[PDB]
Every structure is written in C-alpha cells, then in structure tokens.
Amino acid sequence: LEFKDLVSLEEFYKEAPPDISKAEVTDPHQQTLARLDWELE
Amino acid sequence: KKQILQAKRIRKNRQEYDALAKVIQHHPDRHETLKELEALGKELEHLSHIK
Amino acid sequence: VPLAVPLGQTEVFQALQRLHMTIFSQSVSPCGKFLAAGNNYGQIAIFSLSSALSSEAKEESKKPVVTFQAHDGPVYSMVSTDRHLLSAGDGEVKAWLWAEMLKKGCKELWRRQPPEINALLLVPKENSLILAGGDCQLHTMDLETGTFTRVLRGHTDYIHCLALRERSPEVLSGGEDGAVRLWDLRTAKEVQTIEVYKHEECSRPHNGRWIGCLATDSDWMVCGGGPALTLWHLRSSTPTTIFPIRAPQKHVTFYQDLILSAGQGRCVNQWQLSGELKAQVPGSSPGLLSLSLNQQPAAPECKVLTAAGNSCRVDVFTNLGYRAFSLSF
Structure with missing residues (x-):
C-alpha cells in the first residue's frame, strides 16, 4: 500500500473528439487516462 | 486476499498515471503557452496591419 | 556427472537429437491438467502437468505421457480451444482432439491450407482463426467450415506475432519489416501503423529492425x-x-x-510498468522462446509459469523467484 494540472470536466467532455473522449468511460480510471492523453495531444 | 488484489490493481493504475505524466512533463506548460500564443497573436495582428 | 552413457547407435542418435532440440510452441488443455509442447522436428509432447505437480511424483512423471510425430516441418505455433488443439506445422494447420490424443489412435480432425505460419491467433466473439507467416499476409479462417474469408496485405516482410485487445481496431500485427500494424476486422483495412525503428529513442541499429513480440492491455502496448x-x-x-x-x-x-x-x-525478466527491473530468475535453457501462464478455471493447482526455448526441456515455475523443476521432452 505504498505508492509514488487538470482540465474542467465539461470543457473536456465537450471539446475533445469522440475518439479521445471515450464515451464508454462515461470508470474514473479511463476518464483520467482520457484527460491525460487529451492534455498531451 | 481480496484487499491485496484490489491494492495491486490500484498500484498498476498509479503506475500508468505516472507513466503518462512523465511523458507529459517532457513538454512545456499549458497556461504559459497560452500567454505566449496570445502575445504572438497580438504581435502577428500588428505586423499584419503594418504589412 | 555423466550419469547415463548411451553406448549404442540408436541411443547416441537419440542423445544427439535431444542435445539439438528447440521447443517453439506451448499450449494448455481446456482443463489445467495437461500441457502440449511443439518440437523442432515436428513432434508434439503431452505433459501431465497435474501429475507432475502432485505430491506423489516420480522421476518418470516428468516425461511425455504421449509424444507423437505430427508435422513434417517444425511446429512453430499451437493454440487451444474449448475442445481442440490447433497446430500449425509445415505450411498447414492440423487439428487434434484432447480426448483422443491421450489414447492410442491419435488421428487428426482436418487439414486446412490457405511458407511458414509463425503466429496463430484464436479470435473469440466469432469462430475464427488468423493465420500469419511467410506469405506476408493475414488470412482469416472460419472454424466450422474450412473457408478463408479475409486476406490482409500491409506488411513488407514476414510476420512474427499477433495480438488482440477487444476494441474497434482489435488486431495488432508485428513483423520483420519493423512496424506494428492495426487491422480493423470489419472494414478489413489497415487503420494505424507504428514504426518503432524510426523513433530515435528505440532504434538500436546493431541488432536490426524486427519485431518479435507484442502484448496488449487494451490501452497500452509492449513492443x-x-x-x-x-x-x-x-x-x-x-x-x-x-x-x-x-x-x-x-x-x-x-x-x-x-x-x-x-x-x-x-x-526470465520481471519488469515493473514504470521501467524498473524487478527480478531476473535464471532458467535451465541458454535461451527462451516461449512463456505461458496457465491461468485456467476448474484447476487452480495447475497455476504455473512454463518457459521453453533452445533446449529439450521446459522450466516450470510454481513461484516467480525460482524454478521448481523441468520437464524433459
């Protein structure tokens, strides 16, 4: 049990293309991964 | 056993998050890029008006 | 140290074949109880894995219970279904029954022929089988009837491995040309190409450009x-x-x-997903070509990691820090 910026949610959900929006994630894990690679792109 | 399975899954998720975040941190910031894009857009509009 | 000296032409020849043996493929039964190993010489060994992992275990229990000649050329790939064992040999795929390969008959079900066949991908959600090899083309075959539906042409040189991740592209393929290609099964087209040698972080021009292995986590890839x-x-x-x-x-x-x-x-190399070398567990072979996690229901006692390569023996890991034993071919 030891381990090691952001976008507004509606802006992220309404600006990203549906390839990167990943409407099947609407899990929080894939949601955060979609936020991360949307920030990267 | 059930809690340690969930713990190792959460650890894999955290390592995926760190793996993406390290690649993002090789790129410059977001808001500073927005500020310099606004400055470059104003300078480009002034240079376009002068041209 | 030389315990068994052969002393005879047939036994010297058998010792020479065992000394020059390479084990290419591995497959597991529908239950956990049996293992199947493909051979350099086109042979197939069947390993009673539950009998090897039992408390009552003899030195002759680490031997093939049934070994049989199955192909003319080498067995480069196996895969297993709910009932069958598909084995790609010379240039064609044979099918064997798990119930009948233990018996004395050992007949084949079919023989379908679409160069070698390096990778067999067994596709769920539809009874299908993807062939890939020295034809530089991906063939799709129905499992019920021996008809070949799709032919996919994207690679330049031959293919080493296939993958599956259950999304819209759903099929990865990596080859000797040095590019991982994505193959949408619906449109039967190539949708994305990742050239790994072009990126300077990965290049290493001494070994060359060839992709031997792929893996999917449905969002990630290891190449x-x-x-x-x-x-x-x-x-x-x-x-x-x-x-x-x-x-x-x-x-x-x-x-x-x-x-x-x-x-x-x-x-065997155990990495963490961050990129830190967690462990290196030594095996008995000088080089390895195949790993297999035996994660099957209705047999939790047959949950081991089996490794094979340039030897006549298979390393069985009951734990991920040391080898328990090894099965001779």
Missing part, C-alpha cells in the same frame, strides 16, 4: 525484438518508457502488474 523493449501508448503512438536490457526479447506478456520477458539470455 520488443530487434530495436528495444518499449512501452507504447495506443491512440497516441508515443514511446512512453524503455526497458534497459541488452539481449533481444523473443516473447513478452502482461502479468497482474508486472511485465514478463524472455529472449536470447538465460533468465
């Missing part, structure tokens, strides 16, 4: 072989992390939260 053992992010096609190892890696897979690897070295 290795010639260039480097690299972690790619799909939908971005960006090299995220590199695993620092010198030897080329012939096989890779995802564990629970580890990365298992094996190649021209002696040991």
